[PDB]
Structures are given as C-alpha cells and as structure tokens.
Design a protein around this ligand. Sequence first.
Ligand SMILES: O=c1cccc2n1C[C@@H]1CNC[C@H]2C1
Ligand SMILES: O=c1cccc2n1C[C@@H]1CNC[C@H]2C1
Lengths: 202, 201, 200, 199, 205
Amino acid sequence: SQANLMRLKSDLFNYPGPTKDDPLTVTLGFTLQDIVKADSSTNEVDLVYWEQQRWKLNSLMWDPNEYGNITDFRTSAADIWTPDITAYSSTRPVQVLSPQIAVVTHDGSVMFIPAQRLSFMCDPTGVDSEEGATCAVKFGSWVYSGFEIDLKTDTDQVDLSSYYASSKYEILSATQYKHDIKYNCCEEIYPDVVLVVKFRER
Amino acid sequence: SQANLMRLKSDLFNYPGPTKDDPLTVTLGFTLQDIVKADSSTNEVDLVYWEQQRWKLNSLMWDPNEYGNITDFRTSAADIWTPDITAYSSTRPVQVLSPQIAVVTHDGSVMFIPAQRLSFMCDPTGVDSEEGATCAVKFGSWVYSGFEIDLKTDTDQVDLSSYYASSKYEILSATQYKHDIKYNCCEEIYPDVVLVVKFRE
Amino acid sequence: SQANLMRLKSDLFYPGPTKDDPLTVTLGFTLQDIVKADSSTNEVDLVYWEQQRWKLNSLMWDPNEYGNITDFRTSAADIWTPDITAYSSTRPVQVLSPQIAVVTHDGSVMFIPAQRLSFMCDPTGVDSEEGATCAVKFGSWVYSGFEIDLKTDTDQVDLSSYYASSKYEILSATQYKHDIKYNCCEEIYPDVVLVVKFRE
Amino acid sequence: LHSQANLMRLKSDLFYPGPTKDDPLTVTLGFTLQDIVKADSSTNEVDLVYWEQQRWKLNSLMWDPNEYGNITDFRTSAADIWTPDITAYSSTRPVQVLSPQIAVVTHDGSVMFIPAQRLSFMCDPTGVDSEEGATCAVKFGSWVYSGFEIDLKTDTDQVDLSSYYASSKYEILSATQYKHDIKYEEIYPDVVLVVKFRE
Amino acid sequence: DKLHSQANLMRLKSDLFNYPGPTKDDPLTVTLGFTLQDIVKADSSTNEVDLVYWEQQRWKLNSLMWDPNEYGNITDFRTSAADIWTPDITAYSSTRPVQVLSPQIAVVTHDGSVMFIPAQRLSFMCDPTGVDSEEGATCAVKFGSWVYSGFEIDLKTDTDQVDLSSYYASSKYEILSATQYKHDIKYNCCEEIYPDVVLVVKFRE
Ligand SMILES: O=c1cccc2n1C[C@@H]1CNC[C@H]2C1
Ligand SMILES: O=c1cccc2n1C[C@@H]1CNC[C@H]2C1
C-alpha cells in the first residue's frame, strides 16, 4: 500500500494555474475560532480563523483500481498549486498556525484548511455596548480576475461552532457574502468573499 | 566509523506518510518548562515546553552489523517525515527554541523533542487566587484521522520535573490525558492529547 | 489551453537595464490606511498598494501562436522586478499580498504588492484642523535615471480604497515625480515622492 | 539588444575566497546618519537608521569595456559575490536591512555596496534631555579578519549628516567616524561611530 | 604573491569541501566559553531576562586537516559556518528563539581545529527579584548539545570564569559574579548522560 501511494504521487507529480479558457472554481468558507484582541489606538483587530479552500483539477484525478484502492492522500501544500486568496485589509502579514498540508481525492478535488491569525482594519468603537462593533474584511484572489478564478461559498454564514467560549469578545453575527468589484488598475471584475463580523465585549 | 555512518545515511535516504492500510502510532508527551505569561487583556497564555514525539518506520531499520555496529544516529528533521501534531487553539505560530534534529535508532524508531514557546487561548481569571486558573489545549494531527495516525502516551501526567522554580506562576496540576473521539457523522475516530494546566500566581 | 500556457512559459523561461537599454518604470500608489502615528519616535505606519508597470521585448509573444492566450500570471521570482525602495523607511517593509505579477502578450508587466511601511514622519499637528504633513520618497536603490526612467501616470494618489474608519482621515495625498542632479555629472536620480496631509 | 547580450556575456565570464595575510584587502567604510529613531533609558538601547557605504576592489572583477560594448559597470545581487563581514560590535538586536541587497561593480574591479540599516546598540541616553545632550558610541569592524587581512579605511572622519531627518525627535550635535587600532602580532582596526545628540 | 595565495586558498577549500557528526566510536570534544557583553533588560512581570553574549565554540576534526606546505603555507582560513558542521549547543531555558548578532563565519586551522564565536541576544527564564538590592539577583542558564549525549559530544571549558572584560560599562545592570561550570545530567527521555555548561550570573541595578 505504501509502495502504491508513492507510485501514485510520483505519477501525479511527474498546473500552470487557471486561464480564461480553463477557469477554476474555488469554494471558500470561514470558521472563526476567536477574536484575540482589538486595538482602539490603531483600529486593528486580531482574529484566529480556519480558511477552508476547495477546488478540483482534472490533472489530479486517478482510478483507485489502478492504485490499490487509494481514495485520497495527504500532501504538502507546496507540492501543488494553491489559490492566492488574500485578505484585502490586513495590516500585518497573515500568520499561519497549522501545517500546510492538503487533502487530494481521486476525483481531483483538493481541500486545504490553513489556520491563521490576522490583523485587519477594524474600528472597535461600540464594542463595550450591547449593540457591539461591526467590521468587515474582504477575501479574494489578489491577481486572478473573475474570468480565471470563479469564487464561491457553500453557505452565507460563518461557522461559529468552534468559537472560543471564553474569548474576550462574543460574536453577535458573522456572515460571508460574495461580491463582485472592479478595480482601477484593471478592467476585469474581481470576485471576493466578505466576512462581516458583529462582536462585543463578553 | 564516520564512513560507515555516511554510507548508512546515504542508503537510508536513497516515506509518504501513513495510510489506513499502513497506520502509524505516535507517542506524545510534554515536559513543561515554564508558564511565561498570562494576558487577561487578550485571554492568551504563553507556555514553554518540550514536546517529545516518538514513532517507528520499517523504512528506517538497519542491521548494526552491516554498518560498523552503529545503533543510532542524529539527523536533521528535514531529512525525514515528521508527524503533523498541532496545537488546536494556538493564537500565534509556535516558536521553536531548539535544534530541529531527530534521533533515529536501528529498529526504525525516531525520537524528536522540539522545545517550543506557545501562545494559546486561555482565560486566566482566578490566577491571582488560591484555586488558581485552569486552561487546556488539544494536540493532534491536523489532517490525519486515527485510522492513519494513532496517538499514545507513556503517561497522563505532564513532566513537571524541570518546571522553572522561580516562574511567575506555580503549577497546581498538569495532565496530558488522551481522548479518542468519534463524531456522530462519521466512522473515523479522532484522537487527541489534551494539555490541562492549573496554575496560580 | 493549459498545455499552451505551459509551452509559452517554457519558451519565455533579463539582466536588468543599462545606460544603452534604459527601462521605463511607472509607479502609482493606492493608499489603504494610515495605521498609526507615533509621536514618541516620529514614525508613521502606512498600508498601501504599490502599482509597478514596465515592459520587456523578451516577454512578448503572438497570442495566435499560443491558443489566443493574451496574458498570464507568474511568481515575481520568475522575472526581473525593479528595486523600488522607500528612502526613509525605519523598519523593513512588510509584504501583505502574494508576490505574483501579470504579464501581457505585448511584453508589459504589472505588479502590485501590498505593503505596510514605517517611515520617518513628525505627526505634530495631526490633532488640529490643519493636520500633519509627511513625505517619503520612492525610487531605485542602485539605478540612476539612465537605467530606470521612473515615471508616474498621475500625481493623484488613489484614495478609493482608503479605510473609511481609520484613526486618520486624508486631507490630501499626492505623488510627485522628482529628481536630483549633480552639476558635475550628467546622471539624474529620479524618485516618486508621496506627500500625505492627514489628521485625527 | 547588443547591450543586453554584452551584459549577459560579461556576467557569465566573471561568474573570491576572501582575503589572506598574503592578499590583504582594503575596505573603505563611511556612514550617512539618516535618523535617530529612539532612545530607551529603561534598557540603555538607542535605535539608529544609517546607510553604510562599503567599497573594495578585486582583480577578479576587472574587465575591458572595449570587449563588452563599453559596459563600464553593472548591478548584481550581493549574494552573487563576496562581501566584507563588517559588523557592529555593540548591537543588541540583529541589524535590520532596509534596502535591496544589490552591489555596483565597476570595470576597474571595484565594488560599492550601500545597505541601509536600522540598528539597536548599547547606549546610555542620560543627558539627552539637556543642553549638553547624550553621547554614545558603537564600533564597526570585521568579525573574523585582522588588519593584516582586511585593511579598514575611511574617506573622512565626519559622518555624513546631509540627509539627517530634519524633524527627528533628536537633533545631532556631532557625529564622527574616527579610526582606531587595537593591539593585543596582528593589529585590529575599527571605525567607531560617535554620536552626540539631544531631544 | 597575492594571486598565488588566492589560488592556493581556493584549491585548499575545494579539496576540503570536495562530516556526518560525532559517533560513539568517534566522539568529539567541544570546548565552550562565554563572554558577557551586557544584560539588556529584566522583566519582573514575566521573569525573563535578556542577555547579549558571545559564545566561543572550539572543536577539532581530522577531515579538516591539511599541510601548509601543500597549499602555499596557509595556516588557517575563514569560511561561512554553513560550509561546515557545527555543534548544536542550545540554551536550555530560553523563552524566545535566540537571535544572532554577528556574521556566521568560522576560523579553520591546519590542524583541523575550528573556532566559531557567534554573538547572540537571549531571553531566558530568570526571576530578577532583589536586583534593586545590594545582594542583587542570581540566575542560571544551562547550555549544551540538544541531541548528542556525553558519549558523542564531550563538553569542556577552558576556565570557570565568564569573560567580563567586554561588559558594557553603562549597562543598567552591573555584574557581581559570573561563572561557567560543567555538569552531567540524566534526562527522562534517554538512558545516556548529557553534559552541559551552566552560566550562573549574579547582577544588580
Ligand atoms: O496585483 C494585482 C493583479 C491584478 C489585479 C489586482 N492586483 C492587486 C489588487 C487586488 N486585486 C485586484 C487588483 C488590485
Ligand atoms: O532532543 C533530544 C534528543 C536527545 C536527548 C535530549 N533531547 C532534548 C532534551 C535536551 N537534551 C537532552 C535530552 C532532552
């Protein structure tokens, strides 16, 4: 079985990114673990979250019958192409908290779920009130337009089922709606997923 | 002997990770050096510990008689596969405080003991009291279920034998119980080792 | 299509400019936010996007020879990129976006890294109606105007993404094309000067 | 086109194990002090921003411009070449580089490298809030080479203050870069930056 | 003469570089000494203290031996620490990753001895209580190989005294005493004994 897995990986590794004629659908979903801190002197808020990314490539397909019934495998994210999904309003480089390892399945679908800590632009005024503070952060491909990476979601709600119950901040709502925007630099429209979080001091 | 060691290393390096058909047992244990800080403005606590990891691979076996009676060697952890054991509630990238070097023994067993500083989600309310504060952080594989990586411990007690005697925080209790969790949704069993620390000023 | 793109990239894969092959580099700033202003050290921190454009003959192709591919994306480390540097930073610049460029069939490259910069700036007056004014120059570290001809498309900094709830509001943001020369020597050193007037 | 081809050819033709007692290298140092960012009296650390000019010359980097289309100099990554190990003796944090790591090589074989850096070094800022000010010093020299191997020179005793930030928290009263030798048979040279400054 | 010396050095380096670590049958002696430059700060809110020091490391390998006559009488040379094996001497009680302050360059001598002296800033567990009193505070920090036992790396000192001759005269903290003593310790993880050099510093404001 180990020999079969090594052979399968060797065959697969022995993708130039999407194109307008071969666009890629990337599904995005956010799980918000915690709101670590809010800095009212700089309007920066720190969040810990899991960013679930899923896409499918014909080049990553295989027949499990030809490889000892291997249905899927784990591999370093550096072994494959991954989408350049970026927070648009970070104020510090995003910090990764989990192994960079993807799960590839025989139908060519890949699931990547890195855990990260992000500092982003957010005014926490009103967090010390019952109505709380509201902030947003956009996520999208930095360089690929809607014609190359089509960006989708499975749900309009951020997954709060793992939110740290003793966080300094409690979540009032958290949504993840898709938006289409045009930037001054380029004519083509760029899709994005915007996380809108309403939160308050616990 | 030096030539024998280089030959052994060359032969060994000239593993794809575990599978359901070829699963791997990883033994985990913690030595808690110190609780550096507790931050009640963010509910983050910072620990320094040694994370001892042990596992064993047939592909790393050899006969000492074939290599000058060498029974073990040291090698960079980048030369070998290592398990993806991760703290599930960290708030900052773990900081490595020791060389990334493993010890490999002729029976194929590997011993890795990185020293790290970890910031994790923890409410320190009560740390300034007699009963102290309590916090917990789960360790496990990020991508492997128990059908691929099985977790074991040699003991459910954290090694406190070198805990810093003049730390700002004294340890009331520290355990590393192992839990096998089966979700209602799926057949696979997920195992974790949970560090539970009770401490006070 | 994917095979055509791979063949094009292999075919394509520049020593940098010289006095006899000068390269025009166009610079433009999008100012996202003024994160902080530290009156104890006179340092101000900005987040901005630095749009860089240039064009190389060695990056041209005919889309008809490559399945009508007119552009592609590639890692910035696959290609030469200009050494544009803030001249009064006080900390290493921190990169906030993927280091990926857009190459177009006419040989033009577009690269827009997002960065956080700490630079020398006295914010005195930021708590008044007139606000504070600070400036920072951007330009090549090692190339004179004979090798890298630095240009702007406009002097108006793009404020369309400026963070509306920043601690600081922008009174004006201007990007000037400026150069310094020595009478003794022919060489001219150009820079783009970012001047920001802002207040609490 | 011809210039690009010639540059590529020149770089290939050219692509040094460092100096020795029998092949000593002159390294010329100069400082431009851009700013004194901060002074921390709780730890006696001061933070400076400066440009450190380094120049040296190697026979192995010479060429005839006539053979390469009148190319008289070129730019190259500092990792493509040997660089002197000049270091600050009293730094309290790793020096942070603020500029591209790129050097200029000229056809006579001389190399010029001017990294911009932010440095935290040991310094008692006592007096900085007075008319007389504070005075601090930091020595620069090779970590591993003696004066028999790296002959450390300057073009001037004066730190270049023509770019000092006019609105710094700290104004400069004087800034010198005098040379010093220490004998313990080798002689060990340094260049000492001495800054006298005040709020 | 300069051309010949350069050629000789290049040839020597090429021959030398064209070591898998010590073994029980081929143990390595590593000599350690410390120079304490400054005690940058004491944090009583976390019991962390920050030190700047130089760590002098010396060892000797047969594979780095050469004849000076063979290569223009070249007694020694400088080379990047990345070109050679170096020992994994680690601070046992750091609270932050150690920060390197100097070039990583070693001096290799024709008898195969290496000398490597990185300058580092270290944050280590240390309670500074009493630093504001005449007796001062006292802290220790163990150094040793992380992974090689006494049977593979034998750890020695040249002296019991930490070199204070470069200590920063205007530090916030003055040194009352500083010693470096060797100890042999048994750890729970392994049967074999592991040696260490412990730095014991008494200091005050
Ligand atoms: O670098 C590129 C490359 C292509 C397009 C863009 N940029 C970066 C910004 C964020 N994404 C949309 C737009 C502006
Ligand atoms: O990683 C190893 C490998 C071998 C032995 C040890 N460890 C690390 C700790 C520090 N050194 C002694 C002991 C415990």
